[PDB]
Structures are given as structure tokens and as C-alpha cells.
Design a protein around this ligand. Structure first.
Ligand code: HEM
Ligand code: HEM
Lengths: 362, 362
């Protein structure tokens, strides 16, 4: 029904993957540090309400008739829907509020990668909120009301809706398929693997940035798929691109989805072979991305793909090496990265008196 | 999870309980060969029988010749039917092709220009439409993607619209959903159990003058942008006055319960419910079946948000047109703008396994 908001870590990273996403990047419009801290406190208070299925402020109705309602009301009657709200800080935030010397070294700017076609309007951002829930209306309501609360101090830079599985009709254990029709998520870090999360996902105090202890680093990539091109490829071409078969999702030469891959049986430029930790010095990611389908473009093509989200302990040792290794990926024929942003995701809100960003702002 | 039967006197997806998700596509026809188009309709019908039963199209998604593209794109494998319905419609522009000019129904009226219209021509009209509704977005996208693929060379997608959540009801026994203005939308509609009301107001009858359309309906699609910044600063009282119902319960002004009958004289004269109500429009009644959308940001720091309004009716001239004309003075107009428009003739149902979409026309 709901996911606890408080903890050492923000929810929405290691907690169970919800059916739907609304991710928003915001830009900050105030120069006043005190004004921004006040916002973070008001947002935290709102998030406590939202994640428990309650309206923000004094509610969506029943207040003074002459006042705008505190909550815009489109989630009334809905359940918490396992809503999580996860905040992150972009590199550009640290050019404000005297913060330049507190930017973590682990929050690295991404290099340009071969084939990148990044839309500057759908890239970057001073901060992000990742809203995940089983009901898309719950997620949208959250973003819409945070944006409203922050009006005058932040604006929405870009926004992405996504979807994974529908849990009401799909067993939890079953691996979702992406829009290329392949199972996606088989070899990932699971929220159950506490030690692997410590190794690969959570920032530690000895990593160099104390305020980030218990936080993580997020890379977002909006990756368009060339659907109509992919759909004309033979079955064998598609399986060769990945190194797993399409039906069962087993590694080539193996029988079952979760059989461990034998990388040498895969083509040298197969996606799994290039992405696997063993090909990348042990680098391992927590993927937590969502499919998207936004409509059709001016050529009549489906505007669809993967909104890739990766969490890691250090961008320089997680996404960067793995993505660099995909330079010759067979998948590259069929995809294009068109949006990108990175964020530092702070530690959790410890209790009722804490607030988002408290370890940074002090 | 369950399947909705595909065959019947009427197409499913109209009187059917409203599903959670929409993917609507308008297509233009690129072939002038009547026989080629008829063969497409038949192949599409076959596919639809598979898809609505939760089966892959053609020979499947895998297990065929390795050197061939799979017949089904694969991304719905392991999913339930998820109440998928597929509803086809023919736009006025289709009747300029294939010797069909004299068979265009009079009830398929072109809309007049309405005050405030700002229609994008690229996201209006269409030779034909397919409305895919399902509780799982992935299942809806899969259906449209596979129909489009099958249609390659004979049809192109002109425009499409995804709806992330419903803002309509054909099931008064269940909770009425809310639109993004925070109001319940669908209280006084037509229920799928109200056979006499459907016969009166929704299905075309032989005597209406177009035999091939008997058992079909007419569809009006309107893409409506919502000025949420404007709306969100309005007082509670102003918002309730706009509609004539209270926000929390959705009762008519003065009354206690959502489903209490409106007393129209207690509403403001420009209240939406007052203007839209059948009693204000010579008895004209519609089956409303629309969905909410958000398509990112507007470029000005705000979330985009809208309603994709769908209405079914026995005759466009006696349904949508009179009602929309009466909304010329609607208080709601301050907060919305119609930016896309299309009309379609929705043919009768596919009677059995030997029948096909459009068979009464062709
Ligand atoms: C649209 C883009 C992409 C698609 C469709 C895609 C698809 C897949 C699929 C089908 C698998 C195999 C099943 C699984 O273990 O999840 C896989 C594995 C993986 N992908 Fe991708 N991927 C995409 C982009 C990326 C990107 C950008 C990265 C990282 C930079 C990435 C990293 C990985 C990793 C680390 C694995 C697991 C390899 C292993 O340990 O076996 N993928 N991906
Ligand atoms: C963004 C646009 C719109 C919004 C937010 C909206 C909202 C509402 C709401 C809150 C109600 C009251 C609950 C109900 O009975 O469903 C309602 C009723 C209704 N609306 Fe709208 N509506 C919009 C557009 C339209 C349009 C374009 C039409 C027709 C051309 C329409 C026709 C109706 C009708 C017929 C009723 C039922 C009136 C009655 O019989 O009580 N609406 N709408």
C-alpha cells in the first residue's frame, strides 16, 4: 500500500519498483539561500503527506472559499499507491548559494559519447524529483503540487512520464520487457542485496563528501528507440544484438533466463557482453529505468524508448565506464541518446523534524 | 486482467467499462487500391482478434525462421489481455477514396469553428482511427504498434495521443475518476447497462438514413489544453462556481451527494454543468469517454496538461455540436483551449469470426 518516507536512505532507489514514473527536472530561479531552504522544508512536509496518501497543506477542499485550495485535488479518492519521492541536486545547483566547494567529486560531468544527440531542453537541471507510484495520477499529482508550491522559486525544466509493469495483472517476480520485446532487468542489483548496495550504490563517508553519506548518484538518459527499424530486423539479428534469446531471455547457449551468461558465446559487440561487469573491471549499476511512449513524431514514427535511470556510488566508476564500453554496441544502430542529466541524491529524511537537503544546507 | 469480447453487434470500447489507459492513433491512407485496403482491414481484424485475447499476432513473437522479422514485436508477451479494446473509425476524408463518396453518412458532419478554437492541423483529422484502451499501457502501445506495422505501405500514422488516466465513466457503481482540475468527471454519463439510453443516444439505427452504419456510432475527439497555472490560483469558490458542483464530493451545488440530481437554477448561468446538461440542450446527451494527458513541459517552466475529450453519439449534429455551441459562454472557457479536433464514423461490430472491420461499408 505505502512505502515509508523516512529512513537512512531516500526511498525510491532500493525499495520495490513501482509501476509508473513521473520524473521532473527543475531549475532554481532564486538567488536567496534562505528562500531555497524554506522551500526544501515545505517540500519535505508536502512529501510526507503525499507519500501517505494525504493532501498537501490544509487539503483539497473545505478551507476558506475565497482561497485557492492547498492541494489541487486530482488524487482525492486514490490510494498511496506505493508513492516514493526522491530528490536530487544537479551540478548547476552548486554554482548558487555559495555551494561550489561542496559539489561532490563523484558528481562528475558526463563526457560526450559517440552518437549522442542530446536535446539541451531535455537535459540538465538544477534539481530533480523522481516520483514513482503504481498509479500515474498519484505520481503526476505529486509533481504538479510540488511545482505549484515552489512557483516563484523553481520552474519545471523538463518532465518525463514512464511505465514498467502493471502489477495488478503481472506477477511481481516476472521480469518486465522493454519496448524492443526483450526482458530487461534480469542481471541487476536488487533491493534485497544489502551488501551489493553498500558496495555499488550508496555513498560512504570515506568517499570524500560527508554530506552525501547514505545518498547516491543518479544518471538519467532519455534513449529513443528506432522502433520501425528494429521491427524490420530478423529474429536472429535482434537476439545477436543482445546475446540473449527473445522468448525466454536466456544467454546464448543456456536454457533459462537466470542462467549465468557465458560471454564468449556472444558476439563481441553484443550489448550484454559489453555491459557485463566482467567486461568493465567489475563496474556494476542499479538500473531503475522505465519505458516511455510519448506519441508519434512528424515523420509518423513512434516516439518511444527507455528512460534509463542508474544509481551508483560514483558516476566515474559506474555509468561512465560501462557507457564508454558501449561505443561499439550492436544496439547503437537502433537507439539514440537524446537527453541526459546527472544528480546527487542526498541521504534520507531521518525523522519528522528532518528535511530534504539538511546535510548540505546545514 | 480479463478479456473483453471482441465480437458483437457493436464494437467494444464504447459502452464497455472505461479502462485505465488510452492510446489513440489517427492514420492516413496512402494506397488508392480498394482491394489492398480491404485486404488490410481483414488482416487488421485478424490481428485484433489475437490482440484482444492476449495472443501474439500472426505466427508469434518468436520460434519462427531465424532470418525473418517476427510477426509480433514481442513486448506484450506474458501479459494478460488487460481489458484491451480496439475500436476503429473512419474519418470524412476516407470517403474521397475508393469510390466511397456517396456512402459518407450525413451524421458524419464536419464541425463548425467554435469561439476560442486554436486547432493544430497536424494533430487534427485523419482518414481513420484506432482507439486502443486497456488497463496496461504496454498492451495498448503493442496493439497500435503492431497494427501500424501490418499497415506499412498502405497507412501512415498521422497523429497519436496517449492518455495516462481516464476522466470518464460508463459504470456508475464504481468511483468516478477525477480530471487534472481536481473534479470528478463522468457522474452523469450513459452507463453501459442503460440499453435504452444507448439505443436512443449512441448507436446509429437503420432509419437514420445510412444502412451500413446501423449499430455503429459517431466519434468526436477534441484535444483540450488546460491552463493549470490560471486554474491553480483560482479560489475554491471560483472553481466550484465554474462547474456547479462542489469539489470534494462532486455534489450539485446545495446538495449532499455526488449522484443527487442537479438543480440547475441554483448554479451560475455560465456554469459548465448547467450549460452542458441535456435539459439545457433540447435533450441532447453524449457518451463521454475521454482521458487525461500530459506531454512534458510547455517550454515556459510549467507542466503541460490536458484532457483528450472523446464523445460518442448517434449523430454528431444532435450530440456534440449543440452541446459545444451552448458552451460558448461557459465559465470553464477561461481555463481551457481546444487545440486538436477530429470526427469519425465508428462502424458496427464484427459479428463473428468470418466478419471484418468495415465489411458493411465495403
Ligand atoms: C534503450 C537502451 C537499452 C536497452 C533496450 C537495454 C537492454 C538491455 C537488456 C535486454 C539487457 C539484458 C537483460 C538484463 O540483464 O537486464 C540489458 C542488460 C544490461 N544493460 Fe542494457 N539496455 C539499454 C541501455 C543500457 C545502457 C545505457 C546501459 C549502461 C550504460 C545499460 C547497461 C546494462 C547492464 C549493466 C546490463 C546487465 C549486464 C549483465 O550484467 O549481464 N544498458 N540491457
Ligand atoms: C477540459 C474540459 C472539460 C472538463 C474539465 C470538464 C469537466 C466536467 C465536470 C467536472 C463535469 C461534472 C461531472 C459530470 O457529470 O461528468 C462535467 C460534466 C459534463 N460535461 Fe464536461 N468537461 C470538459 C469538457 C467538456 C466538453 C468539451 C463537453 C461537450 C462538448 C462536455 C460535456 C459535459 C456534459 C454533457 C456533462 C454532463 C452534464 C449533466 O448532464 O449533468 N464537457 N464536465
Amino acid at each position: 500500500s505505502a512505502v515509508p518516507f523516512h529512513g537512512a536512505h531516500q526511498a525510491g532507489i532500493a525499495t520495490p519498483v513501482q509501476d509508473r514514473l513521473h520524473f521532473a527536472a527543475f531549475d532554481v530561479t532564486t538567488e536567496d539561500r534562505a528562500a531555497f531552504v524554506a522551500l526544501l522544508k515545505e517540500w519535505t512536509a508536502a512529501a510526507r503527506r503525499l507519500t501517505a496518501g494525504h493532501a498537501v497543506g490544509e487539503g483539497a477542499y473545505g478551507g476558506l472559499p475565497e482561497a485557492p485550495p492547498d492541494d489541487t485535488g486530482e488524487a482525492l479518492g486514490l490510494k498511496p499507491s506505493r508513492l516514493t519521492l526522491t530528490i536530487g541536486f544537479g551540478p548547476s545547483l552548486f554554482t548558487r548559494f555559495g555551494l561550489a566547494d561542496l559539489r561532490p567529486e563523484a558528481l562528475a560531468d558526463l563526457p560526450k559519447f559517440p552518437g549522442d544527440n542530446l536535446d539541451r531542453a531535455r537535459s540538465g537541471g538544477d534539481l530533480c524529483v523522481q516520483a514513482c507510484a503504481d498509479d500515474p495520477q498519484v505520481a503526476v499529482h505529486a509533481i504538479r503540487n510540488l511545482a505549484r508550491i515552489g512557483f516563484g522559486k523553481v520552474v519545471v525544466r523538463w518532465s518525463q512520464l514512464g511505465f514498467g509493469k502493471t502489477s495488478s495483472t503481472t506477477p511481481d517476480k516476472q521480469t518486465p520487457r522493454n519496448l524492443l520485446g526483450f526482458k530487461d532487468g534480469t542481471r541487476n542489483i536488487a533491493g534485497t542485496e544489502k551488501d551489493r548496495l553498500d558496495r555499488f550504490v550508496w555513498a560512504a563517508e570515506k568517499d570524500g563528501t560527508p554530506w552525501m553519506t547514505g545518498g547516491s548518484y543518479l544518471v538519467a538518459r532519455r534513449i529513443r528507440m528506432h522502433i520501425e527499424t528494429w521491427d524490420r530486423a530478423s529474429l536472429q539479428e535482434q537476439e545477436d544484438v543482445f546475446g540473449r534469446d527473445k522468448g525466454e531471455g536466456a544467454p546464448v547457449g543456456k536454457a533459462k533466463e537466470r542462467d549465468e551468461p557465458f560471454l564468449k558465446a556472444m558476439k563481441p559487440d553484443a550489448h550484454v557482453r559489453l555491459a557485463h561487469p566482467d567486461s568493465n573491471g567489475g563496474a556494476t549499476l542499479l538500473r531503475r529505468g522505465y519505458s516511455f511512449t510519448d506519441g508519434t513524431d512528424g515523420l509518423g514514427r513512434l516516439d518511444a524508448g527507455l528512460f534509463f535511470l542508474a544509481y551508483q556510488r560514483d558516476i566515474r566508476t559506474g555509468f561512465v565506464p560501462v557507457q564508454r564500453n558501449l561505443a561499439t554496441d550492436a544496439l547503437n544502430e537502433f537507439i539514440q541518446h537524446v537527453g541526459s542529466a546527472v544528480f546527487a541524491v542526498p541521504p534520507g529524511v531521518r525523522d519528522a523534524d528532518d528535511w530534504w537537503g539538511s546535510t548540505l544546507f546545514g
